[PDB]
Design a protein around this ligand. Structure first.
Ligand SMILES: Nc1ncnc2c1ncn2[C@@H]1O[C@H](COP(=O)(O)OP(=O)(O)O)[C@@H](O)[C@H]1O
Lengths: 182, 52
């Protein structure tokens, strides 16, 4: 579709998102689910209460923040969809799924089920007409411009050494461990 | 007065009433407090819109 394609930097600890042409992801806020911790009393107390971003970092001590991307795998699927709606909101995208092309990224050794469930979101809830789920290591090779490189991610719940060849890694020589700084 | 004339056992020249002489907060300004006023009408109509 003739719109700027969405780039989704699926960071484990710090997820990011953006578009084409740009060098820094247009909208950045980590991967987490900040559920509330109290009950509204005064008129002025916000609602929905599962807030992300400014309210999260702002009211850290008031939001029971959890993390869906456990072992580099999202567990709060529906909540991550709503986090994408948070991105779809006036804050970050201000558009629709059906409008911009989207590009999803991935780590090596990922279960098919996650990709399938994501596609269900992407084409049923969200309805992007131009989308595919790519990798992440080859994208870092695009950044470096290198061809025969070993990519080592460093997140929160994922660590993988990806020996790539011209942007096409041996999908067997790659190793992956789902643990980091968390 | 007429009764004063009526009975004999009544003294006179009596100014019956004899009286004596007769003649005729700070910490809201305390420096360390951030003392605020409200004007409840404005803030009330302001927060009034919060349909919660
Ligand atoms: N300056 C830093 N020093 C050390 N660790 C960092 C620094 N910045 C980010 N990290 C780690 O990287 C993680 C970000 O996750 P991320 O790298 O986005 O996942 P992915 O590897 O999937 O992209 C954070 O959880 C944090 O622990």
């Amino acid at each position: 579709i003739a719109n700027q394609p969405v780039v989704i930097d699926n960071g484990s600890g710090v997820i990011k998102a953006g578009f084409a042409g740009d060098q820094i992801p247009k909208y950045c806020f980590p991967n987490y689910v900040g559920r509330p911790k109290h009950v509204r009393v005064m008129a002025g107390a916000l609602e929905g209460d599962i807030f992300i971003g400014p309210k999260a970092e702002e009211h850290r001590g008031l939001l029971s923040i959890r993390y869906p991307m456990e072992h580099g795998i999202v567990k709060d699927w529906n909540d991550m969809e709503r986090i994408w709606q948070y991105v779809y909101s006036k804050d970050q995208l201000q558009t629709f799924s059906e409008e911009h092309p989207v590009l999803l990224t991935e780590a090596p050794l990922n279960p098919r089920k996650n990709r399938e469930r994501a596609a269900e979101v992407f084409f049923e809830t969200f309805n992007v007409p131009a989308l595919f789920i790519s990798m992440q290591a080859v994208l870092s090779l695009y950044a470096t411009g290198r061809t025969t490189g070993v990519v080592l991610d460093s997140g929160d719940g994922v660590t993988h050494a990806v020996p790539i060849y011209e942007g096409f890694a041996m999908p067997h020589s790659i190793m992956r461990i789902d643990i980091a700084g968390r | 007065d007429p009764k004063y004339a009526d009975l004999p056992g009544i003294a006179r020249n009596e100014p019956d009433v004899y009286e004596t002489s007769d003649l005729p907060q700070e910490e809201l300004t305390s420096t360390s407090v951030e003392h605020i006023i409200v004007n409840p009408n404005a803030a009330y109509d302001k927060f009034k819109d919060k349909r919660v």
